[PDB]
Structure formats: structure tokens, C-alpha cells
Design a protein around this motif. Structure first.
Motif, PDB file in Angstrom:
ATOM      1  N   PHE A 137      10.989   2.070   6.595  1.00 37.91           N
ATOM      2  CA  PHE A 137      10.702   1.793   5.199  1.00 37.91           C
ATOM      3  C   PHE A 137      10.731   0.349   4.785  1.00 37.91           C
ATOM      4  N   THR A 138      10.708  -0.552   5.724  1.00 35.19           N
ATOM      5  CA  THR A 138      10.591  -1.972   5.422  1.00 35.19           C
ATOM      6  C   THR A 138       9.123  -2.348   5.628  1.00 35.19           C
ATOM      7  N   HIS A 179       7.492  -5.955  -4.597  1.00 35.82           N
ATOM      8  CA  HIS A 179       8.485  -6.646  -3.795  1.00 35.82           C
ATOM      9  C   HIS A 179       9.801  -6.934  -4.522  1.00 35.82           C
ATOM     10  N   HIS A 180      10.911  -6.611  -3.877  1.00 32.94           N
ATOM     11  CA  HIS A 180      12.222  -6.852  -4.469  1.00 32.94           C
ATOM     12  C   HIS A 180      13.147  -7.723  -3.608  1.00 32.94           C
ATOM     13  N   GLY A 194      14.769 -10.792   8.138  1.00 29.55           N
ATOM     14  CA  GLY A 194      13.502 -11.368   7.714  1.00 29.55           C
ATOM     15  C   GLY A 194      12.461 -10.350   7.307  1.00 29.55           C
ATOM     16  N   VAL A 195      12.789  -9.047   7.337  1.00 32.91           N
ATOM     17  CA  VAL A 195      11.866  -8.005   6.896  1.00 32.91           C
ATOM     18  C   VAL A 195      12.102  -7.733   5.406  1.00 32.91           C
ATOM     19  N   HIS A 196      11.167  -7.049   4.763  1.00 36.16           N
ATOM     20  CA  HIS A 196      11.179  -6.913   3.328  1.00 36.16           C
ATOM     21  C   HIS A 196      11.292  -5.487   2.819  1.00 36.16           C
ATOM     22  N   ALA A 197      11.894  -5.357   1.643  1.00 36.27           N
ATOM     23  CA  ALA A 197      12.102  -4.069   1.003  1.00 36.27           C
ATOM     24  C   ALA A 197      11.665  -4.139  -0.449  1.00 36.27           C
ATOM     25  N   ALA A 231      18.095  -2.821   7.929  1.00 40.45           N
ATOM     26  CA  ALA A 231      17.049  -1.849   8.191  1.00 40.45           C
ATOM     27  C   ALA A 231      17.408  -1.049   9.426  1.00 40.45           C
ATOM     28  N   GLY A 232      17.001   0.209   9.443  1.00 42.49           N
ATOM     29  CA  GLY A 232      17.191   1.044  10.620  1.00 42.49           C
ATOM     30  C   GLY A 232      16.309   0.558  11.759  1.00 42.49           C
ATOM     31  N   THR A 233      16.548   1.051  12.988  1.00 40.86           N
ATOM     32  CA  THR A 233      15.710   0.646  14.122  1.00 40.86           C
ATOM     33  C   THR A 233      14.279   1.108  13.876  1.00 40.86           C
TER      34      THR A 233
END
Ligand SMILES: CO[C@@]1(C(=O)Nc2cncc3ccccc23)CCOc2ccc(Cl)cc21
Ligand SMILES: CO[C@@]1(C(=O)Nc2cncc3ccccc23)CCOc2ccc(Cl)cc21
Ligand SMILES: [Cl-]
Lengths: 300, 305
Positions: free
Chosen positions: B134-135, B163-164, B170-173, B194-196
Motif C-alpha cells: 500500500f505504499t 499524498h500525505h 523513502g517510499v510514500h503513503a 511499510a510491510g515487505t
């Protein structure tokens, strides 16, 4: 953080895309003020394509032979002229969505966004580089001629490319907006071939600096090299020679990361010699050469 | 010919981007009709972020605390409310450039275009996929919050992302346009990870079909496999399971290229257990998973917007 291949927002160019029809051929035009720019090969009748005399074909055309459509409105062609390989159709209406623009000719290694269009309608936007062999590796189907390459300068669109042709290897050739081809290509169906493509070395270095800025450091090493020794090694891997101008252009990235240009050159030499060993740089297993030093600074 | 990572034309979304300022924080807003949507963390200071009570912070705000700017025109905020993690600022003027739109929540594996903005000004457009964890692997600097993800269906913009946040890797949520986060993330400065991540299997298959359409055939083989045997192998390589729905959605590409889905699955199995052997597919040394089957069909057929 993060690093993506990023195109410019295409809105300012979408408001300029029109459909140009002449006989059975339909392609895209760029409507700026009261002029529609498009590839001159739109006046060719398939047979004409091998050895066309464009001046002769254009003299035989009238303004009513050109059908220009902007959305669901037909534009009236009130004049036509040719500038090199681009046809200029004067229309009776100025484009209200005309942005601040300029026509720029670019050099190999330079990047730009392409708004791929079909029937005067935008279908997608992607980022490209002008290859050292003067082709672009685009994604173009039949009907995409007239699609344009551009960059944005704050509020100003610099148009740098218009799509004209696909070569036998699937790569693409085109012109600046003054109709001059990039490369030794002609708008004729005569046998044409792109030269062997090479890697844009300065762009790879810019992207290695982007990777360091993003925390990827595994490829760094304690070596430095002379520019001459770097070029001798790089050229045996089909890499473009690095000039003193390229070293200077990489200066700001070098000052930001604390890695001298020739120091990063020795990392590039090692990557060419060993490969990646199952590792990636910025999510890529190959060295990326379609980010210029200016793109890296802008994005990071 | 050619295959590129291609975003949707961003023009319909650019006409909606505005700058939202509250206190010392400036981020982007999406102006649709008479409402500006933006991340609710715009009301936070550095202290609030640690443990925010957003309903309490919002009650203490007045309409004049929010400064909304559309180009060089200041919009008048005449109301404010919160829907999950998105703040809705009612304005006195309806956006004349509001396109036909809808708010959609996408699934992992689905792709969308991101219009990255700074100070309400669009700076770039790129294509990404909602990862199975989910990233999104985006490209966002400070000030990019409020940037949106979208798809275009005919002449309708489907807004699917706002975007939040940026995670430590470095990944985004972010959230959908109703303010619900994609993934188990929260909008607070607290330890999050983040999960794998896993590979979007259906998308890799779609991209292998794109390579065959472009003349790259070296990876094709005579073999086929069962969906069960493919899933047993794929899951040991961190690949998402392939469902019967994924097989069906790959159908038109299978008919076009003459390569059945389970036949292409046996090519993917070999590419996993053996690697590429110094070869590339569509100029890539890695299997690309950010093209859905619909993206491949759209690009290898010239659908316009
Ligand atoms: C008339 O257009 C030609 C062409 O390259 N077109 C194309 C341009 N892009 C993508 C294409 C995808 C598939 C099919 C053609 C494509 C074909 C004939 O030879 C020529 C000769 C010269 C010129 Cl300047 C154009 C052309
Ligand atoms: C609102 O700011 C945060 C953030 O992630 N911002 C960013 C979002 N994108 C790209 C960024 C690039 C570099 C720096 C920050 C970025 C950081 C503080 O803690 C938090 C905590 C929760 C949330 Cl929902 C956001 C945030
Ligand atoms: Cl899918």
C-alpha cells in the motif's frame, strides 16, 4: 526523497493539440496563436513518400484541401507555407489557450517530455532523451506524427521536437519546430538507418549523483581517474566521451554530495567492469542515461 | 513501436491545483467545484504531529486561518470540515476548470498518474502503481503533500490518491479523496514502516505481453503450467498470487499475441528460477510490474483523452 522518470505537466501543450487532415492522411498539429504547425509529409499521397518534391506538392494544394479540427470545432485555413520539414497552416482563429512559448533546438543527451497524440487528442505523456545518434526511443503508433516534445521553463513551454518518422529498428526521428531534422534523416521513405546508439555518459553520472543524494552508496569507491583514462574505458563500453564541459556541468552535484566528478567517474568505470552483482541503483539494474544534470538538481 | 512508462495527460488536474496555507505550513489542495481538498495535517505544528487531536485542532480554527491561492487569486474560505484524513475547505468560488470527475479507491497493483505539485504549482507528472504493501514509490520533496493521483476514463478524471507522508525507507503513503489511507498508516509523527513489498504478478505478465507485441520474444518457451503450480513457484519469489480474474483480464493480450496466459506464466517461472542471462526485455534487466493489462492495451492501441 525518491527518484522517478518525470515528465512535465502536459496541460499547456494539450490546449494546443489539433487534428490536421489532408486527403486520406490525418495527423496532429500544434496550434499556437493563428498558426497550426505539422509535419509536411501530411500532403504526401503514399507514392509521393519515396521521392517527394514538397515545394511542388504544396503549390498544388489550396487552403480548403487542409481540414483542421480543434476539439469539435473546424478551424478555417486561410494560408499555408512551409518552413523546412514543417508545414505552417495559418488559421482564422487564434488559440485562446496559447501558452507563453518558444521554439528551441536541443542537443543529444537533452531530455524532454512527449505528449503522444492521435487525431489531435492527447493519449499520454512520457519523458525521453535525444539519443547521441539523434533518434528518440519513443512510443508512437501510426497517427502520432505531429506529437511534440517540450520542456517547461516556469510559465513558458519550450517546444523542441515534432514527431515525423519511425525507423526500421522501432526508434523515432523528428524535427525542431522550425522543421529541421535532428540527425541525418529525411522525410522520405528512402532506406534510412540510425547510427549505433551510445550511452549518454554525463546523464549516467548525474543519475549516480541522484542515487547518492537518495542514500544509495554501494557503488562508490576510493578511486579517482584522469578524464582521458575514463574516456578510454567508457568508449570501449559504447559510452559517449565526457568533455570538460560535462565535468563542469556536474560541479554542483559534486559539491552537494562531496564526490568529485573524476571520483564518480571511477565508480562508473567499476560498474562497467563488474556490473551490478544482483544490486540495483534507484530501483534499476541498468545505468539510467535519460536524466540530465539539470533534471537531477530539479527533482532532488 | 516502442514502450514507455506513460502517464495520463495532466491538464484536467493542473486546472484544479491550488496552494493551501495554514500557519507556517504550505501544501497543495485540489479545487473541485466550491471545495478545496487537502491533507488534514496542514492544521498541525511540529508539536501537534507527535500526537494530534485533529477534531480539537480544527474546532479552534476559523475560515480566515486557511489561506487558499489559485494562481495569483486568493480564494475566500467560507467553511471547513474534515472527512477522515482530508480537510475540506468550502470556498466562495466554484472552479471554472472543474472537469468531469469522480473519487475512486484503487486496489494494490492498479496504476495511476501523479501530478507532483509545490506551492499549488504542478512541477511534474509520473506514473506509479499502488504497491501490494500500500505504499507508492514516488518522487516527492517537502511541500508536495496534497499532490494527487488520478486516472482518466474517456473524459472523466478519477481521483484515487492524495499524498500525505514519506516513510523512513523513502517510499510514500497517502489516502483516497475521501481521506482513507491506503495501508496501515496514520498521519502522525510516530515510528511507521511499510510491510515487505511483493511483485505485482499480473502486471509483469501484462508487460511480457507488451514486449512480445514489440518483437521481444527470447523469453517465450514451449511450456505451460497450472495456475496452482505457477502460484506455488511465484510466491516463493515474493510474487503476488495470480487469480482467475487476473487470467481473464490478460485474455485480450493472450488472443492478440497467440500466447495463452498459463503459457506466459511458464515463461515467467523460468525468468524467476533462472534470471535473464545478460538479456533485457524492453530495455530492462528487471521484470517491470507497474503496467497493468489495461495500460498495455491502451498504449499498444492508442486510446486518447
Ligand atoms: C508516413 O509516415 C512514415 C512513418 O515513419 N510513420 C510513423 C511514425 N511514427 C510511428 C509509426 C508507427 C507505425 C507506422 C508508422 C509510423 C511511414 C512511411 O515512411 C515514412 C517516411 C518518412 C517519414 Cl518523415 C515518415 C514516414
Ligand atoms: C507532514 O510531514 C511529514 C511527511 O511525511 N512529509 C513529507 C511528505 N512527502 C515527502 C516528503 C519529503 C521530505 C520530507 C517530508 C515529506 C513529516 C513529519 O511527520 C509526518 C507524519 C505523518 C504524516 Cl501524514 C506526514 C509527516
Ligand atoms: Cl490489474
Amino acid at each position: 526523497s525518491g527518484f522517478r522518470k518525470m515528465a512535465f505537466p502536459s496541460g499547456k501543450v494539450e490546449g494546443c493539440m489539433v487534428q490536421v487532415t489532408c486527403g486520406t492522411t490525418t495527423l496532429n498539429g500544434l496550434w499556437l496563436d493563428d498558426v497550426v504547425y505539422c509535419p509536411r509529409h501530411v500532403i504526401c499521397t503514399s507514392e509521393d513518400m519515396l521521392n517527394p518534391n514538397y515545394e511542388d506538392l504544396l503549390i498544388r494544394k489550396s487552403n480548403h484541401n487542409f481540414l483542421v479540427q480543434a476539439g469539435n470545432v473546424q478551424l478555417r485555413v486561410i494560408g499555408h507555407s512551409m518552413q523546412n520539414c514543417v508545414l505552417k497552416l495559418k488559421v482564422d482563429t487564434a488559440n485562446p489557450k496559447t501558452p507563453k512559448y518558444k521554439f528551441v533546438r536541443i542537443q543529444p543527451g537533452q531530455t524532454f517530455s512527449v505528449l503522444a497524440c492521435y487525431n489531435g487528442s492527447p493519449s499520454g505523456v512520457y519523458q525521453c532523451a535525444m539519443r547521441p545518434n539523434f533518434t528518440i526511443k519513443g512510443s508512437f503508433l501510426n497517427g502520432s506524427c505531429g506529437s511534440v516534445g517540450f520542456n517547461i521553463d516556469y510559465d513558458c513551454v519550450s517546444f523542441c521536437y515534432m514527431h515525423h518518422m519511425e525507423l526500421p529498428t522501432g526508434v523515432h526521428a523528428g524535427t525542431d519546430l522550425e522543421g529541421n531534422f535532428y540527425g541525418p534523416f529525411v522525410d522520405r521513405q528512402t532506406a534510412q538507418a540510425a547510427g549505433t546508439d551510445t550511452t549518454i555518459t554525463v546523464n549516467v553520472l548525474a543519475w549516480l549523483y541522484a542515487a547518492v543524494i537518495n542514500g544509495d552508496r554501494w557503488f562508490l569507491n576510493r578511486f579517482t581517474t584522469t578524464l582521458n583514462d575514463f574516456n578510454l574505458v567508457a568508449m570501449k563500453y559504447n559510452y559517449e566521451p565526457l568533455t570538460q564541459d560535462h565535468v563542469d556541468i556536474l560541479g554542483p552535484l559534486s559539491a552537494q554530495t562531496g564526490i568529485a566528478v573524476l571520483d564518480m567517474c571511477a565508480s562508473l568505470k567499476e560498474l562497467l567492469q563488474n556490473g551490478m552483482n544482483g544490486r540495483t541503483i534507484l530501483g534499476s539494474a541498468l545505468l539510467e542515461d535519460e536524466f540530465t544534470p539539470f533534471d537531477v538538481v530539479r527533482q532532488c
